[PDB]
Amino acid sequence: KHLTEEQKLTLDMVRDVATREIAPRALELDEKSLFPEYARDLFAKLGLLNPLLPAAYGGTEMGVLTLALILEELGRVCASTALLLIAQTDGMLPIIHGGSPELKERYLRRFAGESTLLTALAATEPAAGSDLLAMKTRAVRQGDKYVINGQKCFITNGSVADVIVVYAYTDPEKGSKGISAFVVEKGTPGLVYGRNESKMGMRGSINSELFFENMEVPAENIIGAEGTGFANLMQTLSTNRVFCAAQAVGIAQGALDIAVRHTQDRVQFGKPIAHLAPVQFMVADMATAVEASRLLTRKAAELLDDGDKKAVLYGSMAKTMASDTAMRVTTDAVQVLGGSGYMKENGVERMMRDAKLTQIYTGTNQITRMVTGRALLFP
Amino acid sequence: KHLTEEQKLTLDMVRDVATREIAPRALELDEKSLFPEYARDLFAKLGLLNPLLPAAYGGTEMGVLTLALILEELGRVCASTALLLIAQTDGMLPIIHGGSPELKERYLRRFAGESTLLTALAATEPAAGSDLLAMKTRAVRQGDKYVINGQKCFITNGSVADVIVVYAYTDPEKGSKGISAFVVEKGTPGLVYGRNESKMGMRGSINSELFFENMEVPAENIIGAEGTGFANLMQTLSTNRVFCAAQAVGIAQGALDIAVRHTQDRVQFGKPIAHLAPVQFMVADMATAVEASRLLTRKAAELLDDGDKKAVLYGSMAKTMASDTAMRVTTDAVQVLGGSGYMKENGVERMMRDAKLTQIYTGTNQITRMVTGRALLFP
Amino acid sequence: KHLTEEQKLTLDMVRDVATREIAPRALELDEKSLFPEYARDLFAKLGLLNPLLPAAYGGTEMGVLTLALILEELGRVCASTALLLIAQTDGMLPIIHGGSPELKERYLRRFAGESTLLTALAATEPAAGSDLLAMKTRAVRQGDKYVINGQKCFITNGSVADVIVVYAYTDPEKGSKGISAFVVEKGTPGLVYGRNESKMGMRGSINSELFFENMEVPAENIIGAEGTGFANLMQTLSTNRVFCAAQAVGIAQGALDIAVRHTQDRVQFGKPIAHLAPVQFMVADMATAVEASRLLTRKAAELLDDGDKKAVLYGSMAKTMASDTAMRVTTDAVQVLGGSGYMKENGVERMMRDAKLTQIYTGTNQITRMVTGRALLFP
Amino acid sequence: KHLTEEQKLTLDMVRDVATREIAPRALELDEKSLFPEYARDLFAKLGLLNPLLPAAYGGTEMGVLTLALILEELGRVCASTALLLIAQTDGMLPIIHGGSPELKERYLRRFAGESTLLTALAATEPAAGSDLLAMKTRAVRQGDKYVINGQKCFITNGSVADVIVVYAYTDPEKGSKGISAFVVEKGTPGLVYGRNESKMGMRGSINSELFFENMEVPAENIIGAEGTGFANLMQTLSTNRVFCAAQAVGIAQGALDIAVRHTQDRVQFGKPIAHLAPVQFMVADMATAVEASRLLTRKAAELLDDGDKKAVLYGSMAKTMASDTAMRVTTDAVQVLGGSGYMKENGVERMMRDAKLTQIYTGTNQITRMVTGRALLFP
Ligand SMILES: Cc1cc2nc3c(=O)[nH]c(=O)nc-3n(C[C@H](O)[C@H](O)[C@H](O)COP(=O)(O)OP(=O)(O)OC[C@H]3O[C@@H](n4cnc5c(N)ncnc54)[C@H](O)[C@@H]3O)c2cc1C
Ligand SMILES: Cc1cc2nc3c(=O)[nH]c(=O)nc-3n(C[C@H](O)[C@H](O)[C@H](O)COP(=O)(O)OP(=O)(O)OC[C@H]3O[C@@H](n4cnc5c(N)ncnc54)[C@H](O)[C@@H]3O)c2cc1C
Ligand SMILES: Cc1cc2nc3c(=O)[nH]c(=O)nc-3n(C[C@H](O)[C@H](O)[C@H](O)COP(=O)(O)OP(=O)(O)OC[C@H]3O[C@@H](n4cnc5c(N)ncnc54)[C@H](O)[C@@H]3O)c2cc1C
Ligand SMILES: Cc1cc2nc3c(=O)[nH]c(=O)nc-3n(C[C@H](O)[C@H](O)[C@H](O)COP(=O)(O)OP(=O)(O)OC[C@H]3O[C@@H](n4cnc5c(N)ncnc54)[C@H](O)[C@@H]3O)c2cc1C
Known part of the structure; x- marks a missing residue:
């Protein structure tokens, strides 16, 4: 520390x-x-x-x-x-x-x-969200090149990235041992951009559909050996979850900060509402959950730096708890501001909208609870 | 029934x-x-x-x-x-x-x-949200007219209403016995419109600031006797809460309907996700909470129709539970749709945004829990 | 109604x-x-x-x-x-x-x-709790009699019942179409009683192990045709769940009643604690959850009386919510009484102990959530 | 660390x-x-x-x-x-x-x-639980001695302690500046023992009423100056809360350990129930909450060792969260064991009974949430 x-x-x-x-x-x-x-x-x-x-x-x-x-x-x-x-x-x-x-x-x-x-990471497809092994993008080696056909969705910065890592089956029958990862450069012929889809929150961010139409990438662009792509993806996921946990801790803290400030300034019933026992209770629960989330996330991040194998377990715990905390705290931070919390000019409603994504991306909280429970029950 | x-x-x-x-x-x-x-x-x-x-x-x-x-x-x-x-x-x-x-x-x-x-109801002011007795709009009788000075905020349909009911102190020292209610017509001189404030949800609705600048309304426009305005407001609140409970039941049901349909259509891991035990669990909790909320709301609405005094208690219970349920169910309905639930085209994110208001308007869920608890502890 | x-x-x-x-x-x-x-x-x-x-x-x-x-x-x-x-x-x-x-x-x-x-109902076995189809008790027809071998556990009033309904495989290979139900009388040779096991709560009740050692029951004692036992058990379960929901509503109400009375009598900080905003909040949530549970249970019970097929869905919703409510309300009712709530003489700690069983018996709340979710997702 | x-x-x-x-x-x-x-x-x-x-x-x-x-x-x-x-x-x-x-x-x-x-600490009285300033035990100086009259309840090891610290008013009109603390030895004339009251859990522990009937303690037995007793009590409370948090972390972990072991051994539906997605989910939430609680508690304990003023805030957060976690995890650990979890021989029901006390003693979780919220809102 x-x-x-x-x-x-x-x-x-x-x-x-x-x-x-x-x-x-x-x-x-x-x-x-x-x-x-x-x-x-x-x-x-x-x-x-x-x-x-x-x-x-x-x-x-x-x-x-x-x-x-x-x-x-x-x-x-x-x-x-x-x-x-x-x-x-x-x-x-x-x-x-x-x-x-x-x-x-x-x-x-x-x-x-x-x-x-x-940069960008392109793994998810319309047919393959939590079930990543159902991805349908295919990579076929032809001489000194791989030919890439398929599509990806929900790719953050997908349409503006200079380098995209694309996951694709090289042997569709080997499942988790049949995926590969490829470097794909902006400007490659056969790389086509789709919609930037409009979202509830995280609106200051590009969210891209990608299409691969006989896209030729040189054979040197494969990341590791053929068939190692799934393990490569799984290793990055442990790190992505910690980053999403840390972002969710920040969201929750930022919403708490605004609510804390409002209770000190907003006067009802003759004194600031911070003097009201139930407002004090909500702020206590919010802050306790933020600090717990922060401690889990910081522990998981240190385990990753130490190359410790238990980072998967604690990263999945931090991701689940931090993002659930951001959702609950932002929901209550809007509550603490009353009507003003529902107004766009006051920021917390956006933080509530932003917070919902952290329960979904880098793996839904249902998938992560399974990562946590399996690591505990089948160590 | x-x-x-x-x-x-x-x-x-x-x-x-x-x-x-x-x-x-x-x-x-x-x-x-x-x-x-x-x-x-x-x-x-x-x-x-x-x-x-x-x-x-x-x-x-x-x-x-x-x-x-x-x-x-x-x-x-x-x-x-x-x-x-x-x-x-x-x-x-x-x-x-x-x-x-x-x-x-x-x-x-x-x-x-x-x-x-x-129509519109104008009670809330920037200085008076839950503390309605702190409202500062004043009504002064002058001959055959009342002169209205003050302001109101968060007035639904305020700027487009032909008839507004305006609450104002006629005797600022008598508190809950010093408020009156007045009919105010569109076009009255001294009635001025402010911002239509931009909200997180319920965006298909007008949300008005109102200002009263020496606004003269005829003395016949007072609703009841001077000093009865607060009781009049309190009597309408019991009814408003039931209407907000019923709207929240609807929001929750609509989000559940979309999530239910998605689990039947969305295939991951070889079969529709409705086959997955945890998805089944979320849908069970959602529907149970919706039906409980519906039963409370329908009971409170019948007590109101019967003129029963216990409608205040059960209306406050229905309002609290229905709106908390809409918030939780819409939050989980977005979760059930995964990434697609975060996309504006699929509707549930808006229902989540709409749902948050029902925990605030017609009285925050903190105020209503006090109405419920006081009615139970001091019957 | x-x-x-x-x-x-x-x-x-x-x-x-x-x-x-x-x-x-x-x-x-x-x-x-x-x-x-x-x-x-x-x-x-x-x-x-x-x-x-x-x-x-x-x-x-x-x-x-x-x-x-x-x-x-x-x-x-x-x-x-x-x-x-x-x-x-x-x-x-x-x-x-x-x-x-x-x-x-x-x-x-x-x-x-x-x-x-x-009377008593004997279905559950050490090897077969939620997985009732794994029960190992066997019924073999021999001339004008069935020979019963096996065992049962957690049988309420098992050792004192004059008539026990015993579920047993007559064709172990047909699974849910290979179970039968049998009337078993107190005094039948080969009926042996085990431990009355000691429980956390519901202590005023007998909880029996039963053993069947070449127990001969006359062939007329079969309830329905061979192979219909599982459907017979499933039909009674819908009714048992409503009864457990109603008992849980009662437990929750009884604990709330004691907590409500204590807030009115217990003086801290110069006035009864019922004057404290957070105590008021806990009582509000408790009562709201009790009334919701009561409404669900009464609806399910009426659907059963009407022979309506939707009783399975609403009975499973009432059972889940009523028993979770009894657990939460009794846990908070002990909290409302402070230290005195932890003392055996004051009753609520027993109600908390009693309440935990209702989340388990007549099917765990995990099993019931599956009954609810499957009925909603696969109607 | x-x-x-x-x-x-x-x-x-x-x-x-x-x-x-x-x-x-x-x-x-x-x-x-x-x-x-x-x-x-x-x-x-x-x-x-x-x-x-x-x-x-x-x-x-x-x-x-x-x-x-x-x-x-x-x-x-x-x-x-x-x-x-x-x-x-x-x-x-x-x-x-x-x-x-x-x-x-x-x-x-x-x-x-x-x-x-x-040893023992004697502060709480029947009239003074959370409202410690309402304690009625009085200490009157008479020459070289203080005369102690009053009573105490819920005193752990009260009747077996060789040294009891007794809090008493020396100036009943100065409130928080009118309390003193006194060393009281076993065997002092006028020290009388009451009931050892019977509890829901923590049954392997003595829970004493104490009475002081013109109890003479020498004037040298006062701890600090007259009127400093309340501050002395408040300083020990920060430490007591951390100890109760740590005990609650242990309870929660012990119940989780038993539930984890049961999921690995208990076979239903052809395989250990640890293979079931919802059991995995409960264990994930349990362990996440235990680890969060452990991290908060260890942080608060280090702040106390460092003499840091922020220990009050983080000790109150750890106490609230650790004890709520012990209550929730033990409640679910009984659930994970099914019927067997309700049986006394299997231990977890006792841990559930033990866990409820940690939400009450060393200050109820309502009082602690106020300590947390006030420290955040009025820093
Ligand atoms: C805005 C955004 C940005 C993202 N950025 C990236 C990116 O840059 N690159 C990239 O490759 N991906 C990205 N992701 C992908 C993201 O992580 C997924 O959406 C997520 O992995 C789930 O996929 P899905 O939305 O199809 O949900 P689905 O898999 O369809 O899930 C639907 C629901 O079913 C549940 N569910 C699914 N499977 C199971 C199971 N086995 N057990 C229990 N419950 C289950 C889920 O929890 C969810 O509630 C992003 C997504 C979004 C929306
Ligand atoms: C979009 C919208 C439409 C509405 N429509 C109407 C309308 O048409 N006409 C009209 O007159 N009004 C309307 N309302 C007013 C609405 O009901 C209020 O916002 C609500 O009554 C609370 O007022 P406030 O926002 O100032 O919150 P505040 O009173 O400032 O509350 C701030 C926070 O403190 C809490 N709090 C406040 N007092 C207490 C207490 N004593 N104990 C514990 N906690 C407390 C609240 O729960 C809240 O969390 C509307 C509001 C909005 C936002
Ligand atoms: C005091 C008492 C009285 C009872 N009375 C009667 C009686 O009179 N007659 C009678 O026949 N029975 C009776 N029951 C039986 C009772 O209903 C069972 O205990 C219950 O059906 C579960 O069986 P089990 O305890 O073996 O739990 P298990 O089936 O071992 O369950 C262990 C845990 O795993 C979970 N689980 C199990 N299967 C699944 C799944 N497929 N998906 C997700 N989670 C799962 C459960 O929810 C539980 O949390 C009684 C039980 C008790 C304890
Ligand atoms: C088994 C046991 C061992 C203990 N050991 C010790 C010991 O060794 N020595 C010692 O001196 N004491 C000891 N304690 C005392 C213990 O800490 C108290 O019980 C606790 O401080 C609360 O006092 P009370 O039980 O009278 O609850 P009350 O103060 O009557 O509280 C009743 C309810 O009202 C709530 N409440 C009270 N005041 C407020 C408020 N201002 N705002 C909101 N809610 C409020 C509480 O949270 C509680 O839910 C022990 C108690 C027990 C039961």
Whole structure:
């Protein structure tokens, strides 16, 4: 838990940036459904866009715990801006962890330093959500190339990513041993963009359909050996869950902060409503659940940094509890503001809308409860 | 519970209208923040706009239970269209219940038959939400007129109502015995409209600030005697809560219906997800909570029709439970649809947004729990 | 819902008996683990021991709704005394509903009038709880007799019943079409009693292991045709669930009544704690959940009386919600009494102990949620 | 968090003792309502009876975190044995923290080393539970002595303690500045024992009424200055809450352990029930809540060791969440064992009974939520 002085200075800069730059922009980002371009460009200049890019490739190579602390601070003021960092890191992790030395040099170097290029991870399909093994995208080797046919949906930053990691069957009969992962570059012929689908929340973020129409990628773009794609995806999922837990902790904290401030300022029955025993009770339950969620998430993030095998269990616990907490706390934070909490100008209704996604993405809370229960019952 | 054949035919017409006319319009009503003019005009032609207007004034004079059944059917497909009927009835109840024979003839006759004119109830102020006795609008008698100064906020249909019931202090020192209620007509000099504030949900509905700047209303427009306004407001609140409970039952049912249909159609892991034990469990809890809420609401509505004093207790129980149920069921209905549930085109995210208001309006669930607990502990 | 004057007078007598006779005995019944012999003998004299015994066999033949109302009143003051009536009725239902005219005359006549004889239902085995089809008791026809070998556990009143309905495989390979039901009389050679197992609550009740060691019952004792036993068991289960729901409503109400009384009498901080906003909130939630549970249970009981097929769905909803409500309300009723609520002399701790069983017996709340969800998803 | 090698060896010994010595005795301790004399005598020989007694007085002087880790291990197998350590430490803390050097030497030396003498804290009265300022015990100085008149209830180990800390008004008009704390020795004339009241759980523990009838204690026995008693009590409460949180974490873990083991062994529907998605879900929620509770408690215990002022806030959060978690997890652990979970021989029903007390003692969860909410809203 002893943060290095590099971790402490980074997070002091992140808190200052979240407060002064990200927060004043959050309402317009949601209202107008804007990509957070200003934040992306600033994060690139500050070294915050690619936190987990290794130093070998010009990156800052902070730990998982540092990123989790950063996501909590950004989630407090703008869930969409936190999602940018989550998507960017998740799009890069399959290459960092399974790519050959040649593949990592060829595709990670372009993200060095202050690069503003974007990544994406393309696994989910209309036929394959929780049942990832039902994905229908196919990769057929033909000489020195793979031919990719299929489609993907719900791909964060899909249509704007310079590098997409695409999961596809190379042997459709081997199931979990028949999937592969491929680097796909923006501009590849046969890569076609669909709708940017309109969402309840996280509106400051791009949500892409992708289509592959005889898309030829060079045979060197496979990440690892044929048939290893599913394990590669599963290894990144443990990390993605912690990032979604940390974002949900931030959302919950940000909504609590606004509710706490309102109880101190809002006067009914002759004194601030913070003097009312039931308001005090709601705030107590909210904060207790936020802090519990924060402790779980920070523990899981440290286990990941330590390469500990128990990170899967505690990451799944943190993801479930943090996101359920964000949903419950934001729902009650709107309640604490009364009618004003239902008004768009006051922010908490957006945080409630943002919070619902964290119970679904990186695996629904039903899927994660199964990951947690199976790890406990079949250790 | 034995519905008359007039009740049964009315509700068969309402279900047909909800399905064929109201539901296909709900997404655009929310997306574009439209007043439900088509529904208003149709309800007027069918005799559904003013259900509680007495037959003496050209009205249909259905019971509270019939309206509650109608609100459940409309809430199932469009919460905003249900809110139109709630606002219209609530704006009329103070006159129906406290108005002199002369006042009722003078202001209720214009709502007879197929009239499309609108009402509103103006009690809430920025300084007075749950603490209604802190309202600052003042009514000063001057000869044959009252002079009204002050303001109101969150007034449903406030800026489009032909008749507004305005609550104001005539003796600011007598507290709950110093408030009066006044009929205020559209076009009165000194009646000024503010913002239509933008909301998280119930977007197909007008939400008005009102200002009174030396507004002169004739002395005949007072509803009852001076100082009786607070009791008049309290008597309408018991009825408003039942209407909000019934709307929340409808919202919850409509979201459950969509989730139920999705589990039957959505195939993951080789069979429809309805075959999955945890999906079955969520649907069981959702439906159980909806039916419990429906039974409470129908009981409270019958007690109101019977003039039973225990309607306050059971109306407050139904309001609390129905609206908490709508919040929980819509939150889980989005969960049951996975990623697709987070997409605006699929409706349930709007129902989740609509559901949050029912925990706040007609009195927050904190205020209602106090009404319930006080009635039980101090009978 | 319109109770007959016979229903109203019966329930006025039951309330008087519950208050004056059953309640003062409840603490000793639990403390000393006594069979409620006094209540059994009194119920027999008043015609309350065998409510569902048909008039054709000397019985009172009240409906399911009347018994459900009786169980609520008894559950309010002594869950163990309510369980006597539940066990007695459940032991009789398989014969009433599936027995031939000859079998019903031969075994139901002994329960006519003021008979104090007892019944029991023996289905559950150590290997077969929720998975009833795994039961291992076997019935082999040999000439004019069936030979019964096997065992049963958790049999309420098992060791004291004059007539036990025993479920057993006659064709172990046909699963749900290979079970039969048999009348077994006290005193049959080869019927052996095991432990009366010691329980957390419902201590005023006998909980028997049964063993069948080449037990010969005459071939006329089969209830219906061979292979119909499972359907017979399933038909009684719908009724048993409603009875357990009604008992749980009573438990919850009885605990609420004590907590309500305590808030009125217990003075802290200068006034009764009923003046405290959070105590008011707990009591509101408790009572709302009790009334919802009561409405569900009464609806399911009426559907059963009407022979409506939807009784399975609403009986499973009432059972789940009523028993979860009894658990939550009794847990909070102990909380409302503070330290005194943890003391055995004050009753609510026993009601909390009693309440936990209702979430388990007549099918666990996990099994019932599946009955509810399957009925909704596969109608 | 880095445990010293003395902490690690102590907790390895505690786990071994809990498993081999404490756990096999837990069922009889509850069944027969026995004081844990064997455990007390063994803890004394191992240096575990007085963990927080300073080294200056012959004690081991482990931290709060070490004791909290010990209480978790003992709470896992016997809540009553954990309560012995909690009561013993709490009875000593007022002297350790507020006593003059002379008073600490005079009364703490007798607890050095392997002493088996017992302490108690006597604050609560029938008229003063949460409202401690309503206590009526009075201390009147008369020459070189104080005369103590009054009574106390719910005093753990009250009737067997060699040293009792008694809180009493010395100036009944100064409220929170008019209470004092006094050392009271077993054998003082005028100290009279009442009932050992019979409880729902924690039955292996003594629960005493105390009466003071012109009880003369020497004037040197006052702990601190007159009027400082309330602050002394409040300072110990922060520590007591953490100890009750840690005990509740242990209870919850112990019940989860039994449920986890049962799902692995209990076969229904052809395979262990651990293969069932809903059982997996319950175990996931249970374990997540246990680990969250454990993290909160360990954080609060470290803040106390660091003398950090934020320990009050996090201790109140841990106490609320840990005890609510013990109640919910034990309630579900009984559920996971089915009928067998309701049987006394299987332990979890006792853990459920034990768990309910942790929501009440050291301050009810209503009082603690107020401590948490006030600290957040009025920092
Ligand atoms: C806005 C958004 C961004 C996302 N970003 C990415 C991205 O960048 N790249 C990417 O590849 N994916 C992304 N995801 C995919 C996301 O993680 C999925 O939606 C999720 O994995 C579930 O898929 P589904 O929506 O089809 O739900 P379904 O699998 O259809 O689930 C429907 C319901 O059934 C339940 N269910 C399903 N299976 C089971 C089971 N076996 N047991 C019990 N319950 C079950 C689920 O919990 C859910 O409640 C994103 C999704 C969204 C909506
Ligand atoms: C969209 C909308 C439509 C509405 N329509 C109408 C309308 O047509 N006409 C009209 O006159 N009004 C209308 N209402 C008013 C509405 O009912 C109020 O918002 C509600 O009565 C609460 O007022 P408030 O928002 O100021 O909340 P506040 O009173 O500020 O409450 C803030 C928070 O404190 C809690 N709280 C407040 N007092 C207490 C207490 N004593 N004990 C415990 N907790 C407490 C509340 O539960 C809430 O969580 C509408 C409101 C909205 C938002
Ligand atoms: C005091 C008492 C009185 C009773 N009286 C009678 C009586 O008079 N006569 C009689 O025949 N029986 C009686 N019952 C039997 C009772 O109904 C059962 O205990 C119940 O049916 C469950 O059986 P089990 O205890 O073996 O639990 P199990 O079936 O072992 O269940 C263990 C856990 O797994 C869960 N589970 C099991 N299967 C599934 C599944 N498919 N999906 C999800 N979760 C699952 C359960 O919910 C439970 O949480 C009584 C039981 C008790 C304890
Ligand atoms: C078995 C046992 C052991 C204990 N051991 C010790 C001991 O060793 N020494 C000692 O001095 N004490 C001890 N305690 C005392 C214990 O902490 C109290 O019972 C507790 O402090 C509450 O007091 P009460 O039971 O009178 O509850 P009450 O104060 O009567 O509370 C009744 C209910 O009202 C609620 N309530 C009370 N005040 C408020 C408020 N202001 N706002 C909202 N809700 C409120 C409470 O939460 C509770 O639900 C013990 C108690 C027990 C039962």
